[PDB]
Ligand binder design. Structure first.
Ligand SMILES: O=C1CC[C@@H](c2cccs2)N1Nc1ncnc2[nH]c3ccccc3c12
Length: 167
């Protein structure tokens, strides 16, 4: 039993909800919140901009130190940093950005990072401003993640489309 509330069960381990991941993180304080990161951990917009703003820019400060020490992430890669006031940990995961020409086949590699964590609150990777089809992203998530994932979908219209079209 966990503290997540109001989710639709899609499969044994994948759940989905129409919600703002920031407010969901602030309420649940999950062990792991996933950020829709880029390789430079520059959290300007989309999910990343929203998570960072909610931390009063502490996420960005921590991230800049991480990059100064380690260099950029790989597309498809991840790193574990603090969750600040939102979660115990933030798993920054780099889905491919279609608006940069990155290979959508890397989306599966991105979701594989979730399997290192027993339970996660997450957005759909590569959706939104990363330019991929959210229906496809959900399919890859379901077919790749084996741990317990709670997906927050900000757009109410999009959520209903994902559910109604889910196979
Ligand atoms: O609903 C989806 C599906 C793909 C993804 C993206 C859409 C555009 C770029 S990325 N998204 N957005 C969000 N996901 C989680 N929490 C969110 N809180 C919000 C508060 C205001 C506005 C949007 C969101 C939002």
């Amino acid at each position: 039993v966990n503290s997540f509330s109001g989710y639709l069960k899609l499969t044994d381990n994948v759940y989905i909800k129409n919600a703002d991941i920031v407010e969901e993180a602030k309420k649940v304080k999950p062990t792991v919140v996933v950020n829709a990161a880029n390789v430079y951990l520059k959290h300007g917009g989309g999910v990343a901009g929203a998570l960072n703003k909610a931390t009063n820019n502490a996420m960005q400060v921590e991230s800049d130190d991480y990059i100064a020490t380690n260099g950029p992430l790989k597309v498809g890669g991840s790193c574990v940093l603090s969750g600040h006031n939102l979660a115990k940990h933030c798993l920054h995961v780099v889905g491919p950005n279609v608006n940069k020409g990155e290979d959508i086949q890397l989306l599966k590699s991105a979701y594989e990072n979730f399997n290192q964590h027993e339970v996660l609150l997450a957005p759909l990777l590569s959706a939104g401003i990363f330019g991929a089809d959210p229906i496809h992203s959900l399919r890859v998530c379901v077919d790749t993640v084996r741990t317990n994932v709670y997906l927050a979908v900000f757009d109410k219209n999009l959520y209903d489309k994902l559910v109604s079209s889910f196979l």
